[PDB]
Scaffold this active site. Structure first.
Site, PDB file in Angstrom:
ATOM      1  N   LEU A   1      76.605 -37.655 -32.146  1.00  0.00           N
ATOM      2  CA  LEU A   1      77.357 -36.597 -33.055  1.00  0.00           C
ATOM      3  C   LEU A   1      78.748 -37.801 -33.445  1.00  0.00           C
ATOM      4  O   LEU A   1      79.226 -37.673 -34.354  1.00  0.00           O
ATOM      5  CB  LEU A   1      77.623 -35.708 -32.199  1.00  0.00           C
ATOM      6  CG  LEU A   1      76.795 -34.569 -31.679  1.00  0.00           C
ATOM      7  CD1 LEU A   1      77.393 -33.561 -30.937  1.00  0.00           C
ATOM      8  CD2 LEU A   1      76.270 -33.749 -33.184  1.00  0.00           C
ATOM      9  N   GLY A   2      78.865 -38.433 -32.307  1.00  0.00           N
ATOM     10  CA  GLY A   2      80.032 -39.470 -32.357  1.00  0.00           C
ATOM     11  C   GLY A   2      80.058 -40.541 -31.419  1.00  0.00           C
ATOM     12  O   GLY A   2      79.324 -40.624 -30.549  1.00  0.00           O
ATOM     13  N   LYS A   3      80.859 -41.648 -31.860  1.00  0.00           N
ATOM     14  CA  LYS A   3      80.691 -42.869 -30.879  1.00  0.00           C
ATOM     15  C   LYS A   3      82.267 -43.396 -30.560  1.00  0.00           C
ATOM     16  O   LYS A   3      82.925 -43.486 -31.649  1.00  0.00           O
ATOM     17  CB  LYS A   3      79.919 -43.896 -31.207  1.00  0.00           C
ATOM     18  CG  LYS A   3      79.386 -45.070 -30.581  1.00  0.00           C
ATOM     19  CD  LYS A   3      78.551 -46.196 -30.939  1.00  0.00           C
ATOM     20  CE  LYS A   3      78.050 -47.017 -29.881  1.00  0.00           C
ATOM     21  NZ  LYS A   3      76.504 -47.622 -30.338  1.00  0.00           N
TER      22      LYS A   3
ATOM     23  N   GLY B   1      82.988 -44.528 -25.570  1.00  0.00           N
ATOM     24  CA  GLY B   1      82.896 -43.058 -25.703  1.00  0.00           C
ATOM     25  C   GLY B   1      81.476 -42.600 -26.264  1.00  0.00           C
ATOM     26  O   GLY B   1      81.215 -43.088 -27.570  1.00  0.00           O
ATOM     27  N   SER B   2      80.768 -41.751 -26.044  1.00  0.00           N
ATOM     28  CA  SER B   2      79.535 -41.364 -26.684  1.00  0.00           C
ATOM     29  C   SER B   2      79.263 -39.596 -26.633  1.00  0.00           C
ATOM     30  O   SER B   2      79.447 -39.157 -25.429  1.00  0.00           O
ATOM     31  CB  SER B   2      78.361 -42.052 -25.964  1.00  0.00           C
ATOM     32  OG  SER B   2      77.213 -41.387 -26.492  1.00  0.00           O
ATOM     33  N   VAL B   3      79.150 -38.954 -27.670  1.00  0.00           N
ATOM     34  CA  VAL B   3      78.841 -37.704 -27.564  1.00  0.00           C
ATOM     35  C   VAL B   3      77.817 -37.332 -28.467  1.00  0.00           C
ATOM     36  O   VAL B   3      77.618 -37.684 -29.480  1.00  0.00           O
ATOM     37  CB  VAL B   3      80.099 -36.775 -28.232  1.00  0.00           C
ATOM     38  CG1 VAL B   3      79.690 -35.408 -28.351  1.00  0.00           C
ATOM     39  CG2 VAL B   3      81.564 -36.983 -27.465  1.00  0.00           C
TER      40      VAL B   3
ATOM     41  N   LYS C   1      78.775 -34.963 -23.451  1.00  0.00           N
ATOM     42  CA  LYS C   1      79.661 -36.407 -23.648  1.00  0.00           C
ATOM     43  C   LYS C   1      79.192 -37.381 -22.386  1.00  0.00           C
ATOM     44  O   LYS C   1      79.187 -36.912 -21.144  1.00  0.00           O
ATOM     45  CB  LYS C   1      81.329 -35.907 -23.105  1.00  0.00           C
ATOM     46  CG  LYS C   1      82.297 -37.051 -23.567  1.00  0.00           C
ATOM     47  CD  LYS C   1      83.684 -36.367 -23.681  1.00  0.00           C
ATOM     48  CE  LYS C   1      84.615 -37.568 -24.401  1.00  0.00           C
ATOM     49  NZ  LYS C   1      85.985 -36.938 -24.284  1.00  0.00           N
TER      50      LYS C   1
ATOM     51  N   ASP D   1      95.610 -36.208 -23.664  1.00  0.00           N
ATOM     52  CA  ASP D   1      94.867 -36.572 -24.884  1.00  0.00           C
ATOM     53  C   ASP D   1      94.708 -35.932 -26.158  1.00  0.00           C
ATOM     54  O   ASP D   1      93.753 -35.513 -26.595  1.00  0.00           O
ATOM     55  CB  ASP D   1      93.572 -37.302 -24.614  1.00  0.00           C
ATOM     56  CG  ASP D   1      92.847 -38.259 -25.417  1.00  0.00           C
ATOM     57  OD1 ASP D   1      93.479 -38.788 -26.277  1.00  0.00           O
ATOM     58  OD2 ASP D   1      91.516 -38.483 -25.107  1.00  0.00           O
TER      59      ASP D   1
ATOM     60  N   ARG E   1      91.495 -35.134 -33.230  1.00  0.00           N
ATOM     61  CA  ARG E   1      89.944 -35.604 -33.067  1.00  0.00           C
ATOM     62  C   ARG E   1      89.535 -34.682 -31.896  1.00  0.00           C
ATOM     63  O   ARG E   1      88.374 -34.581 -31.695  1.00  0.00           O
ATOM     64  CB  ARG E   1      89.999 -37.012 -32.838  1.00  0.00           C
ATOM     65  CG  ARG E   1      90.527 -37.486 -31.612  1.00  0.00           C
ATOM     66  CD  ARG E   1      90.732 -39.086 -31.242  1.00  0.00           C
ATOM     67  NE  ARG E   1      91.372 -39.481 -30.290  1.00  0.00           N
ATOM     68  CZ  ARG E   1      92.772 -39.640 -30.332  1.00  0.00           C
ATOM     69  NH1 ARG E   1      93.145 -39.902 -31.838  1.00  0.00           N
ATOM     70  NH2 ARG E   1      93.497 -40.164 -29.538  1.00  0.00           N
ATOM     71  N   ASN E   2      90.371 -34.252 -31.050  1.00  0.00           N
ATOM     72  CA  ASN E   2      90.192 -33.523 -29.835  1.00  0.00           C
ATOM     73  C   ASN E   2      90.201 -31.906 -29.941  1.00  0.00           C
ATOM     74  O   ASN E   2      90.239 -31.268 -29.135  1.00  0.00           O
ATOM     75  CB  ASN E   2      91.142 -34.085 -28.607  1.00  0.00           C
ATOM     76  CG  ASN E   2      90.389 -35.336 -27.990  1.00  0.00           C
ATOM     77  OD1 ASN E   2      89.231 -35.474 -28.286  1.00  0.00           O
ATOM     78  ND2 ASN E   2      91.162 -35.980 -27.438  1.00  0.00           N
TER      79      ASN E   2
ATOM     80  N   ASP F   1      88.200 -31.242 -24.854  1.00  0.00           N
ATOM     81  CA  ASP F   1      88.541 -32.231 -23.884  1.00  0.00           C
ATOM     82  C   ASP F   1      89.279 -32.380 -22.779  1.00  0.00           C
ATOM     83  O   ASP F   1      90.688 -32.742 -22.772  1.00  0.00           O
ATOM     84  CB  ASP F   1      88.857 -33.789 -24.718  1.00  0.00           C
ATOM     85  CG  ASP F   1      89.231 -35.016 -24.246  1.00  0.00           C
ATOM     86  OD1 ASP F   1      90.005 -35.628 -24.682  1.00  0.00           O
ATOM     87  OD2 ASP F   1      88.396 -35.090 -23.192  1.00  0.00           O
TER      88      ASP F   1
HETATM   89  O1  LIG Z   1      79.803 -33.495 -34.489  1.00  0.00           O
HETATM   90  C1  LIG Z   1      79.660 -32.231 -34.360  1.00  0.00           C
HETATM   91  N1  LIG Z   1      79.222 -31.495 -35.032  1.00  0.00           N
HETATM   92  C2  LIG Z   1      78.694 -31.544 -36.654  1.00  0.00           C
HETATM   93  C3  LIG Z   1      79.950 -32.090 -37.604  1.00  0.00           C
HETATM   94  C4  LIG Z   1      79.118 -32.499 -38.549  1.00  0.00           C
HETATM   95  N2  LIG Z   1      79.749 -31.795 -39.913  1.00  0.00           N
HETATM   96  C5  LIG Z   1      81.017 -30.989 -39.864  1.00  0.00           C
HETATM   97  C6  LIG Z   1      81.368 -30.673 -41.194  1.00  0.00           C
HETATM   98  C7  LIG Z   1      80.258 -31.404 -42.114  1.00  0.00           C
HETATM   99  C8  LIG Z   1      79.268 -32.106 -41.232  1.00  0.00           C
HETATM  100  O2  LIG Z   1      78.175 -32.485 -41.358  1.00  0.00           O
HETATM  101  C9  LIG Z   1      80.005 -31.793 -32.823  1.00  0.00           C
HETATM  102  C10 LIG Z   1      79.588 -30.765 -32.350  1.00  0.00           C
HETATM  103  N3  LIG Z   1      79.995 -30.303 -31.310  1.00  0.00           N
HETATM  104  C11 LIG Z   1      80.930 -30.914 -30.517  1.00  0.00           C
HETATM  105  N4  LIG Z   1      81.141 -30.363 -29.135  1.00  0.00           N
HETATM  106  C12 LIG Z   1      82.366 -30.765 -28.464  1.00  0.00           C
HETATM  107  C13 LIG Z   1      82.236 -31.532 -27.470  1.00  0.00           C
HETATM  108  C14 LIG Z   1      83.530 -32.520 -27.144  1.00  0.00           C
HETATM  109  C15 LIG Z   1      83.840 -32.452 -25.844  1.00  0.00           C
HETATM  110  C16 LIG Z   1      85.155 -33.319 -25.345  1.00  0.00           C
HETATM  111  N5  LIG Z   1      85.609 -34.064 -26.488  1.00  0.00           N
HETATM  112  C17 LIG Z   1      85.139 -34.060 -27.587  1.00  0.00           C
HETATM  113  C18 LIG Z   1      84.158 -33.345 -28.155  1.00  0.00           C
HETATM  114  N6  LIG Z   1      81.383 -31.833 -30.855  1.00  0.00           N
HETATM  115  C19 LIG Z   1      81.044 -32.517 -32.059  1.00  0.00           C
HETATM  116  N7  LIG Z   1      81.583 -33.401 -32.458  1.00  0.00           N
HETATM  117  C20 LIG Z   1      82.209 -34.384 -31.643  1.00  0.00           C
HETATM  118  C21 LIG Z   1      81.884 -36.115 -31.644  1.00  0.00           C
HETATM  119  C22 LIG Z   1      83.038 -36.809 -32.404  1.00  0.00           C
HETATM  120  C23 LIG Z   1      84.121 -35.991 -32.648  1.00  0.00           C
HETATM  121  C24 LIG Z   1      83.701 -34.506 -31.712  1.00  0.00           C
END
Ligand SMILES: O=C(NCCCN1CCCC1=O)c1cnc(NCCc2ccncc2)nc1NC1CCCC1
Length: 224
Positions: free
Chosen positions: A10-12, A13-15, A31, A106, A110-111, A124
């Site tokens: 979902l994101g890259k 720290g790695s989620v 995470k 933090d 983004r958080n 977070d």
């Molecule tokens: O990416 C996600 N969902 C799909 C989005 C894709 N979209 C959105 C609109 C159009 C589209 O295609 C996502 C879904 N669930 C969680 N859960 C929180 C976990 C968390 C915990 C602590 N700190 C930080 C995040 N995080 C996510 N992203 C994280 C990785 C980078 C930024 C936060």
């Protein structure tokens, strides 16, 4: 523990997205990188704080399809009412956490996460968002949490812009000490920028509380 199936990044720290298992299968976010502090964070419950599903090291949080506030702001750019409500939501979450003596450290767009009902929750549990004393003294308090909130407010108002974009991280301390701050965005409501500017007082005691911010943002929200 490994009762979940690690999947897409979902994101890259790695989620990473995962599938937690008594009934069927629930989609979560993991995470990838302790247990004493996760026992404290598990007790938190508020409509504007992202819940802790658990831990395994890695942190298990709710999956949230609308993603993070910062991408959403950026997506829109490439109504003041909606922007101010985002701020109210973050302030409620933060008011709650600091009432439980929790210092976030933090806070940034983004958080902040968009829920299913498009409300914003603080996520977070744990240099451009850091107060002067966080930079100079590694002091982290509710007041440096309010500073970070004020930068987040600025991010919302500029719709995802990098703070101090024309300035390097190594020069941030020097910039701030000189009494320079983030500038008022064009078409930013004076009342919004005034409250945001208050968050960046060198004197940490002169910064409004999250209760104060919530009230003064809620007041603005009534003068629509
Ligand atoms: O990416 C996600 N969902 C799909 C989005 C894709 N979209 C959105 C609109 C159009 C589209 O295609 C996502 C879904 N669930 C969680 N859960 C929180 C976990 C968390 C915990 C602590 N700190 C930080 C995040 N995080 C996510 N992203 C994280 C990785 C980078 C930024 C936060």
């Amino acid at each position: 523990e490994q009762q979940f199936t690690l999947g897409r990044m979902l994101g890259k720290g790695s989620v990473r997205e995962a599938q937690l298992k008594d009934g069927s299968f629930v989609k979560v976010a993991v995470k990838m990188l302790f247990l004493r502090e996760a026992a404290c964070m598990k007790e938190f419950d508020h409509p504007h704080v992202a819940k802790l599903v658990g831990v395994s090291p890695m942190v298990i949080l709710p999956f949230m399809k609308h993603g993070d506030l910062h991408a959403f702001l950026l997506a829109s750019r490439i109504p003041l009412q909606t922007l101010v409500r985002f701020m109210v939501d973050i302030a409620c979450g933060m008011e709650y956490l600091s009432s439980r003596n929790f210092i976030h450290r933090d806070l940034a767009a983004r958080n902040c996460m968009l829920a299913e009902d498009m409300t914003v929750c603080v996520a977070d549990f744990g240099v451009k968002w850091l107060a002067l004393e966080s930079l100079a003294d590694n002091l982290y308090t509710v007041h440096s949490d309010v500073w970070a909130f004020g930068v987040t407010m600025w991010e919302i108002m500029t719709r995802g812009q990098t703070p101090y974009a024309g300035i390097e991280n190594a020069e941030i301390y020097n910039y701030l000490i000189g009494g320079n701050r983030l500038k008022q965005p064009p078409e930013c409501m004076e009342e919004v920028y005034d409250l945001m500017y208050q968050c960046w007082s060198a004197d940490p005691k002169q910064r409004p509380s999250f209760t104060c911010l919530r009230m003064e943002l809620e007041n603005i929200l009534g003068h629509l």
